[PDB]
Amino acid sequence: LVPMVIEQTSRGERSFDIYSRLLKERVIFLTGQVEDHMANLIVAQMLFLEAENPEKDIYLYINSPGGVITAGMSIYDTMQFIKPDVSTICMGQAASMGAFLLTAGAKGKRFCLPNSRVMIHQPLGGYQGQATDIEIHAREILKVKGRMNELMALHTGQSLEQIERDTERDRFLSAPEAVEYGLVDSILTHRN
Amino acid sequence: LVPMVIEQTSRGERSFDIYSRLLKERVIFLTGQVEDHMANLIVAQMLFLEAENPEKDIYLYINSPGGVITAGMSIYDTMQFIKPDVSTICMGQAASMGAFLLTAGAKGKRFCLPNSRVMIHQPLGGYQGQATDIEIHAREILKVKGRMNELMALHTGQSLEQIERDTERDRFLSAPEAVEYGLVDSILTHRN
Amino acid sequence: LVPMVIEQTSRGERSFDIYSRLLKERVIFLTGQVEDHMANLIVAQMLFLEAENPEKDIYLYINSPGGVITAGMSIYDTMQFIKPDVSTICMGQAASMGAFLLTAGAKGKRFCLPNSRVMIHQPLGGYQGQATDIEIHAREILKVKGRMNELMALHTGQSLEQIERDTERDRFLSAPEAVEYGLVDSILTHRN
Amino acid sequence: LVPMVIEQTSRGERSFDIYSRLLKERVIFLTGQVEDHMANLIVAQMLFLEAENPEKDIYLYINSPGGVITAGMSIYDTMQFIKPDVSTICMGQAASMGAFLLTAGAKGKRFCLPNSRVMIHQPLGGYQGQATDIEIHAREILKVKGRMNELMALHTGQSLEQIERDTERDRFLSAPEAVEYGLVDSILTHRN
Amino acid sequence: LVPMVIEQTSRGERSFDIYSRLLKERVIFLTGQVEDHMANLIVAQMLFLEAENPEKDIYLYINSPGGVITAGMSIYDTMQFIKPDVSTICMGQAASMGAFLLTAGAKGKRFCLPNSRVMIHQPLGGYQGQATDIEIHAREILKVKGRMNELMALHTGQSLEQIERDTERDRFLSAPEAVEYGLVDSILTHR
Amino acid sequence: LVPMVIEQTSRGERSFDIYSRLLKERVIFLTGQVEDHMANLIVAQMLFLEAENPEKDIYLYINSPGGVITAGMSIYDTMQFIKPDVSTICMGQAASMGAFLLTAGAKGKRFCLPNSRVMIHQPLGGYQGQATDIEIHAREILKVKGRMNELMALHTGQSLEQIERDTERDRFLSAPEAVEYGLVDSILTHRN
Amino acid sequence: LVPMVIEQTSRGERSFDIYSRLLKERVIFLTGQVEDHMANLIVAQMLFLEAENPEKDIYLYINSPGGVITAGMSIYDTMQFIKPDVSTICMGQAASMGAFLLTAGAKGKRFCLPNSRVMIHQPLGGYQGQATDIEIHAREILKVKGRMNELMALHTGQSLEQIERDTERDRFLSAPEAVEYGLVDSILTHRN
Amino acid sequence: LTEAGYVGEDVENIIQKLLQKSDYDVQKAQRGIVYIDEIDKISRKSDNPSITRDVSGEGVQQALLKLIEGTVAAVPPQGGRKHPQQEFLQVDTSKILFICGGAFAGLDKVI
C-alpha cells in the first residue's frame, strides 16, 4: 500500500502519493527489473520535468538488478537528449543496466551511498533456430556489446580495451572502488 | 503505479496522470506487444486529437517488440486516414510492426534515437487442419506478406525486390542505417 | 490504464475516459472475443443513445476475431429494432460474427478500411453424450447455419445458395472484394 | 470497462454508470451463469425498485445459459411477491433456468427477440456417498422436477403431461415456437 | 459490478451501492459459504444497526449451503446478544448452518419463500493424528452436536429426541413442512 | 464487499466504511489467521485510539484459529503498554494465540460468548538442517513454551504446573469452563 | 482492508488511511520480507519527513523476518545520511536484516518490547555456474559478511571478533539479552 | 450585509436603522449603541484560494474594520442605494459602541 501525504500549498492543501510528491521535486525512482513498461514511465517523467524547468537538475535513484538492454537505452538516450543534467544516485545495488544508467549521469553529479554495490557484466542473450538466423542474432549482441563498452568507456574515462577485459566476466565494485573506476564521482555519507 | 502531476490553468489547478498529461500535448505512447485491445485505445486517442485540432501534428512514440498484424493495420490505416501528420519516434527498439508503423509516419517527421534498434521480418503464422484449409490460410499470409512489403517500399522508397530479399530473414538496422534505408528521416542526438 | 480527457462546456470542465468521451459522440467499440458480458454492454450503449437522440446515426467499430453466436444475435436484433441507423466500420479484421454484424449495418452506411481483413465461416460447435442428444444439438446448429446464411444473403444481396457455397469453408475477403460481395458499401481511404 | 454516462437533470450534471443508468429506468440485466451471488444482487435491485414505485413495471433482460436452481428460484419468488409486474425479455438465449424466469414474467408482458433461442431441460444433479444418502438426494431432485414442471405449466398454460414429456430431454425452441408453447407472448421485431 | 443507486432527500442527493442502500433499511444479506471473514462482516452490520437504533427490527436474508460451524455461532450469539429482534427470511435455500440461523430468528419473525428448500444435518469434521488427540477432537465435535441439537430444539419447539433422529442424516424440507416442524413461522407468498 | 455507511456531522454527512465506522467507537476486529501484516494493522488501531482518548476502554472481538506467535506477541505487548483497558471478546472460537490474547485483556473486562469454543495448545514449529542448528532452534521454541505458559498463569491465575499439564495436548474449553479456569471473567448472555 | 480514519482539525477534517495518519506523526512501518520495492518506499518516507522537521526524531517499527541485503543497505544508509535521529522499535521479531536496522538506530533511541525476539546470522546466498564465476561471487559475499560484522560491532559496541563468533550460526536473543549485547538500549514495558 | 459594489447589501445601512430611533438626528445618534447578530456566518471559508472573492464573508469584515474603530460614513437619507445622489448623512461611528453577537458553531472542537 502506497501512503498519501499532504502538501501545504498557497491554494489550500493537496493530497499526493509519496512518489508523486517527490516527482514534483524532480526526483524519479528507478526500482526493479528494467522493462519496456516502466522505462516508458520514466521517460514520461523526464520529459514532463523538462518542460517545467529545463535549467533545474533532475535526480534519479537507481536501485535495480538490471534488465532488458533496449528498455534501458531509451532512458539513456532520453537523458542525454534533454537539456537538464540528470544526477544519478545508487541505492542498494546497480547491475549492468543500473550501472550503465548510473555512470550515464552528468559529470560531477553521479553519486553512490557508501554501502552500495555495483556490478558490470557483458550482455546476455540467446536464440533458437537455424544456423543462418543464429549468425544474424549473434552479430547484433556482439555489436551491442561493443556499443555498450564504448559508451561506458566515455563516461568512466577508461580505455576501451580495459572495459572489455573487466566486462568479460561479472565484476563487483564497491562505492569507493567505483570512484577510482570512474562510474561515479563522489560518495554521499552524511548531510552537510 | 503511474504518478499524478498538477497542471496550472486559468480555471485552476487540475490533477492528471502522467500519460493523460502528455496526451493533452498530442503525445501517444505505444508500448509492449501489439494487440487488438491496446490498438483500439490508440485509435481512439488519434481520433480524439483530430477533433481538437486537425492541423497540429501528432506524435507517436514506438517502443514495442511487435505483435498481431491486424491490430497494427488498424493503427496504420487510422494514421493515414486522418489529416494530421503523425510523427513517429523510435525509443529503445522497433520490431516488424513497430517498424512498419514507424516508417508509416509522415514524410520528414519520422525520427529515431541514436541507440535504438530497428528490426524488420516477414509475417509469422500457422494453421492446423485439413489440407484444403491449409491452402486457404497459406494464401492469405502470402498476400499479407506481399501487401506489407508493398507499403514498406512506398514509405522507405526502396524497390519492392530489395524489400523482399532483405525481409526474407530477420534484419536488424541501427539508427543511422535506417536513415539510409528510408525507414526514418533524422536522428535526435541532442536538443538544439 | 485508460487515458482521461477533459471536455469543455458552458457548465464547466468535465473529465471522461477516452472511451466514454467517444460514447458521447455516438461511437461504440466492439473489440475482442464476443461473449455474453461484452454483448450486454454494447446493448446497453445502443439503448442509451437511442433515448438521447433516436434520429442521429450510431457508429460501431468492429475489430474482433469472432465469438459466440448467441451473444451476437442479441446485438444484431438490437440494431434492427432501434430506429437509429447503425454504421459499421471494420478496423483490422472482422471474423464470422464481426462480419455478420458488419454487414448487418444500415444499407449505405457500412464502411471498411483498406487494409482490413474480413473472414466468414459456417458455425462450429460440439456436443458429447448420447446419440439421441447429439441428434437434437446437431439439428439445432444446422438451423443456426441456415438462419445465419439467410440473413447474410439479405444484407449482402447474394443468393442463399451462393452464401452457402462460400461459407462452407473459411473465405478471406479484402476490403475491395467485400464491396463486390456486398458486405460493405464503400472504403474510407482518406478524410475528405 | 464500463463506460460512464452523464444524466442531465435540473439538480445538476450526474455521472452514472451504464448499468446504473438503466437501473434508474427500472431495467435489470440478468447475464451469465445463475449463481447465489448474482441472484442476491438482482433481488436487491427488485426490492429497491418496488419501494420507489410499486405501480411501474420492471423490465428483466435475460441472456444466460442457466445455472443453479436454488439461486434462480429465489428470483422467481421475488418477482411473484412484489406488486409491480416484471416484464421479461430474452436476448440471445434463455436456457433451462433462464427460460423458467422468462416464462415466469407477467402475463402479456413477456417478450422475446426474433433470433433468440429458448432451451428447456429437466434438472440435473449428483451425489456421492452411501446408498441411504443417495435415496434422500434422489427423492429431493425428483420433487424439484415436479415442482418446476408444475410452475412451468401454469405460466405456459400447457398440461403437466405435455411439459413432462417435452422436458425429458433438451428441447430448443425458436422465438415463434415459444409463442405457441406459451413461454412468451410477443416478438419485438421493430420499434413502432 | 454492483450498481449504484441515488437517494433523494430534502438535504441533498447521495450515491450508494445497492447493498449499502438496503443496509440503511436494516437489511443484511447472508450469502455463500459461511466463514470467519464473511461472518465478521455480518456482525459489524448488526452492531452498527444496534447503535443507530436499538429498537427497530433487523432483517436477515439467508441463502447459503452451510459453512464453518464456529463462524456460524458468532452470528447466532450476536443476534441473541443484541436487543433488536433479528428477522430471518430464507431465499433460495438454507442448509445446516443457514437453517440454524434461520430458526434462530425472533419468534414470530421467521419467514421463508414458498419454493425455498431447507436442509438440516449433523456437524461434519475430521482430524488426523495420534489416537489420543482423536479422542479429544471426537469428544469436542460430539459436544457441539448435542449443543446444536439442544439449541435447534429450543427454537423449533421439537423435542431433543425428535431433533436427534431427524438430524442424523440429511433431511430436506420445504417451506410448508418447515412451518409445522417449527423452523419458520409463516410463508411470504404475496404482498 | 465492505458496505459503506453514512454518519451525520455538524459539517455534513460523511461516508465511512463498516469497519472504520466501528473503529471510531473503539471497536477492533481480530479475524482470521494471525500474521505480521494484520498484526501491525491492529497495533496501529490500538495506538490511534490511545491518542483520541487514553482513558476510554477498547473492545477487541477475537475470532481466529491462531497463527504466528511472534506476530501475536506484538499485539500482547501493545495491549499491556497502552493505558486504555482492552476488553477482549471471544466470538466463535479462540485458539492458542486467540486465547492468549483473550485472557491478556484487562482483569474484569474479559468476556466470552456462551457458544464460543476456546482451545489451548503448546507451540508447534519445525526446522530442517544440521544437528547443531536443530539444537539451537529446539532451545528457542522451548523457551517460548515456558514464556507463554508463564504469562498464561499470570492472567488466568492458575499454577504453572497445572498449565503445563493442560497445554501438553489440545484442550477444548467451553465458555463456562473458561470462566472457572480463569481465561475469562464472565459470559455476555445479553446486553442487559 | 486498512481502515480509514479522520483527522479532527480546523480548516476541514482530512480522511487518511491508518498507515498514512501515523506517517504524519513520523512513524514508518517496516514489516515483511525486505525487498527493493518496500525498501525504496521507506526511503521516500525518510527523505520526505526530513523536509518537515530535520530536528524531530523519526520512529521505525520493525517486525520483519529478514530479507535481501542490498535493499537493507539502502535503508541503513538513508538512516545515517538524514540528520533526524531514527528511533527503532522491535515489535514481534527482528531477524538478521531487521536486527541490523534495529541496532542501526541512534544511540540511546533503540527500544524493544519485552516479549520481542531477535536473531542474527551471517549472510546466505548461492550461485550456479562456472568455477571462475563462483570465485567472484564467493569473494563478494564474504566481503559483505565482513562488512556487515564491522557495522554491527560499531553499533552494538561488541568486538569484531565476538560478532564473528556469535554470528557463525543462528543466535536467538531475547529482549533483555539484546540490551546486554548492545543491539538495543532499553525496553518499553508500560507507559510512564 | 454584503461587500460594497454588490446586489446583496452595504454595511452603511446599519446606521439607517439607528437613525430611525434617533429621529434621524446625527448629534444624538453618534452616542448610540449597535448590536450585530449572526456574525459567525461571516467567517472565512476553509482553505479558500481567495479567487472566489467572498462577498458574504471576508468582504463584510474588511468594510466593518474602519466602521468599528470610528470613521465618517455616508448614510442614504431613507431606503436608497448608494449612488451619486448629493444627499448623504455623514454619521461618525467613533462613539457608537458595537456589540457583535454570534453562535460560533464548531469552535468548541477548535478549543
For H106, name the nearest residue in chain F, comparing CA atoms only.
Answer: F10
Alpha carbon separation from D99 to C135, D182, E116 (Å, rounded): 22, 11, 19
C-alpha cell at D10: 435540473
- At CA G4, angle to CA F191 and CA G8, rounded to 5? 90
- Residue E122, exposed/middle/buried by CB under 10 A (0-12, 13-18, 19+)? middle
DSSP character string of H42-97: GSPPTT--STT--TTTHHHHHHHHHHHH--EEEE-SSS--SSS-S--EEEE-SS-E
Residue A74 backbone dihedrals phi, psi, to 5 degrees: -60, -40
* Helix or strand holding residue F173 (H, E): strand F171-174
Residues shown for chain B? 192
Residue C151: closest CA among C35, C78, C84, C73: C73
H107 Cα to chain F: minimum distance (Å):
11
**Integer Cα distance of C10 and C7 in angstroms:** 10
For F44, name the nearest residue in chain G, comparing CA atoms only.
Answer: G18
Alpha carbon separation from G14 to B3, E3, E169, G8, H99 (Å, rounded): 21, 28, 57, 7, 35
| Residue F159 near residue F135, CB atoms below 8 Å | no
Alpha carbon separation from G122 to D36, G141, G163, G181, H71 (Å, rounded): 54, 10, 10, 17, 82
- Number of domains within chain B: 1
Residue pairs between chains A and G whose CB atoms are closer than 8 Å: 95
For H51, name the nearest residue in chain A, comparing CA atoms only.
Answer: A11
Facing residue for F147 by CB, picked from G4, G32, G115: G115
- Point out which residues pair with H75 in neighbouring strands: H89
Cβ contacts (< 8 Å) between E79 and chain F: which residues? none
| C-beta atoms of G2 and A1 within 8 A | yes
Q: Which subunits have 3 or more CB–CB pairs within 8 Å of chain B? A: A, C
Residue pairs between chains F and G whose CB atoms are closer than 8 Å: 93
**Integer Cα distance of D139 and D116 in angstroms:** 34
| Residue C60 near residue C85, CB atoms below 8 Å | no
**Integer Cα distance of D82 and C26 in angstroms:** 37
Facing residue for C92 by CB, picked from B47, B74, B83: B74
DSSP character string of chain B: ---EEEEE-SS-EEEEEHHHHHHTTTEEEEESSB-HHHHHHHHHHHHHHHHH-SSSPEEEEEEE--B-HHHHHHHHHHHHHSSSPEEEEEEEEE-HHHHHHHHTSPTT--EE-TT-EEEE--------S-HHHHHHHHHHHHHHHHHHHHHHHHHH---HHHHHHHHSS-EEEEHHHHHHHTS-SEE--S--
| C-beta atoms of A13 and H47 within 8 A | yes
Residue C120: closest CA among C165, C78, C86: C165
Catalytic site includes residue C137: no
C-alpha cell at D106: 407477467
- Point out which residues pair with D112 in neighbouring strands: D90, D187
Catalytic site includes residue F121: yes
Out of B133, B170, B174, B186, which one is annotated catalytic?
A: B170
Facing residue for F18 by CB, picked from E41, E133, E136: E41
Interface test with H, best of A8, A9, A11 (most H CBs within 10 A): A11
Residues of A serving a catalytic function are: 96, 121, 170
Domain presence at residue A192: no
Domain presence at residue D192: no
| C-beta atoms of A64 and G36 within 8 A | yes
- Point out which residues pair with F60 in neighbouring strands: F28, F88
Domain presence at residue C192: no
* CATH code (residue A115): 3.90.226.10
For B172, name the nearest residue in chain A, comparing CA atoms only.
Answer: A140
Residue C5 backbone dihedrals phi, psi, to 5 degrees: -125, 155
Cβ contacts (< 8 Å) between D171 and chain C: which residues? 136
Interface of H with G (CB under 8 A): 46-47, 109-110
> Beta-carbon neighbour count of residue E170 at 10 Å?
18
Facing residue for G3 by CB, picked from F23, F76, F143: F23
- CB-based contacts of A3, cutoff 8 Å, min separation 6: A17, A18, G17, G19, G20, G23, G45
Cβ contacts (< 8 Å) between D65 and chain C: which residues? 36
| Residue A52 near residue B10, CB atoms below 8 Å | no
Out of E85, E121, E137, E166, which one is annotated catalytic?
A: E121
- Tell me the three state secondary structure of residue E133: helix
Interface of E with F (CB under 8 A): 2, 11, 14, 16-17, 19-20, 23-24, 36-37, 39-41, 43-45, 47-48, 51, 70-74, 76-78, 80-83, 132-133, 136-137, 139-140, 143-144, 147, 151
Cβ contacts (< 8 Å) between E51 and chain F: which residues? 25
Residue G94 backbone dihedrals phi, psi, to 5 degrees: -150, 105
Cβ contacts (< 8 Å) between G12 and chain H: which residues? 46-47
Q: How many helices (H) and strands (E) does chain E have?
A: 7, 9
- CB-based contacts of D126, cutoff 8 Å, min separation 6: none
Q: What is the resolution of this structure in A?
A: 3.1
Catalytic site includes residue B121: yes
| C-beta atoms of B116 and A77 within 8 A | yes
**Integer Cα distance of D97 and B44 in angstroms:** 40
- Tell me the three state secondary structure of residue G94: strand
H50 Cα to chain G: minimum distance (Å):
14
**Integer Cα distance of B148 and F165 in angstroms:** 82
| C-beta atoms of E78 and F91 within 8 A | yes
- Tell me the three state secondary structure of residue E151: helix
Phi-psi region of G37 (alpha: psi -120 to 50; beta: other; left: phi over 0): alpha
- Point out which residues pair with G129 in neighbouring strands: none
| Residue B52 near residue B23, CB atoms below 8 Å | no
Looking from the CA of G19 toward its CB, the CA atoms found within 13 Å total 22
**Integer Cα distance of G24 and G7 in angstroms:** 11
- CB-based contacts of F131, cutoff 8 Å, min separation 6: none
Q: Which domain holds residue C113?
A: 4-187
| Residue E91 near residue E119, CB atoms below 8 Å | no
> Beta-carbon neighbour count of residue F152 at 10 Å?
24
Phi-psi region of E67 (alpha: psi -120 to 50; beta: other; left: phi over 0): left
Facing residue for E191 by CB, picked from D37, D74, D83: D83
DSSP character string of chain C: ---EEEEE-SS-EEEEEHHHHHHHTTEEEEESSB-HHHHHHHHHHHHHHHHH-SSSPEEEEEEE--B-HHHHHHHHHHHHHSSSPEEEEEEEEE-HHHHHHHHTSPTT--EE-TT-EEEE--------S-HHHHHHHHHHHHHHHHHHHHHHHHHH---HHHHHHHHTS-EEEEHHHHHHHTS-SEE--S--
Residue A74: closest CA among B57, E47, B89: B89
Cβ contacts (< 8 Å) between B133 and chain C: which residues? 169-170
Cβ contacts (< 8 Å) between C39 and chain D: which residues? 63, 92
C-alpha cell at E40: 465478521
Residues of G serving a catalytic function are: 96, 121, 170
Q: Name the DSSP class of E67.
A: B
Residue G26: closest CA among A3, F72, F71: A3
Cβ contacts (< 8 Å) between B152 and chain C: which residues? none
Residues of D serving a catalytic function are: 96, 121, 170
A9/H contact by beta carbon, under 8 A: no
Residue H6 backbone dihedrals phi, psi, to 5 degrees: -130, 160
Residue D91: closest CA among C146, C135, C80: C80
Q: In which residue are the cell numbers 462460400 written?
A: C166
- CB-based contacts of C155, cutoff 8 Å, min separation 6: C103, C104, C105, C107, C182, C183
Q: Name the DSSP class of A9.
A: -
Facing residue for D64 by CB, picked from C14, C36, C137: C36
- At CA E147, angle to CA E143 and CA E152, rounded to 5? 150
Alpha carbon separation from H105 to A39, F10, H43, H45 (Å, rounded): 53, 8, 11, 13
**Integer Cα distance of B125 and B68 in angstroms:** 10
Listed in order, strand segments (DSSP E) in chain E are 4-8, 13-17, 27-31, 58-64, 86-94, 110-112, 117-120, 171-174, 186-187
Cβ density class E6-28: b for 16+ within 10 Å, e for less: beeeeeeeeebbbbbbbbeebbb
Q: Which subunits have 3 or more CB–CB pairs within 8 Å of chain F? A: E, G, H
β B58-64/B86-94 pair status:
parallel
- CB-based contacts of G115, cutoff 8 Å, min separation 6: F73, F76, F77, F147, F151, G175
Residue G155: closest CA among G127, G120, G190: G120
Interface of A with G (CB under 8 A): 1-6, 13, 15, 18-19, 21-22, 29, 31-32, 61, 63-65, 91-93, 113-117, 169-172, 174, 188-191
Domain presence at residue B192: no
Q: In which residue are the cell numbers 466492439 written?
A: C30
| C-beta atoms of A115 and G17 within 8 A | no
- Point out which residues pair with F39 in neighbouring strands: none
> What is the crossing angle of helices D96-103 and D131-156, to 10°?
40
Q: In this structure, which amino acid lies at residue E11? A: R
**Integer Cα distance of B148 and B159 in angstroms:** 13
**Sequence-separated contacts (24+) of C132-141 with Cβ below 8 Å:** C132/D169, C133/D169, C133/D170, C136/D169, C136/D170, C136/D171, C136/D172, C137/D170, C140/D117, C140/D172
- At CA G75, angle to CA G69 and CA G78, rounded to 5? 140
Alpha carbon separation from F53 to F25, F59, G191, H27 (Å, rounded): 11, 14, 15, 59
| Residue B88 near residue B101, CB atoms below 8 Å | yes
| Residue A182 near residue A103, CB atoms below 8 Å | yes
C-alpha cell at A34: 528494467
- CB-based contacts of F121, cutoff 8 Å, min separation 6: F95, F96, F167, F169, F170, F171
**Integer Cα distance of F44 and G63 in angstroms:** 13
C-alpha cell at G85: 535521529
DSSP character string of D112-150: E-TT-EEEE--------S-HHHHHHHHHHHHHHHHHHHH
F123 Cα to chain G: minimum distance (Å):
15
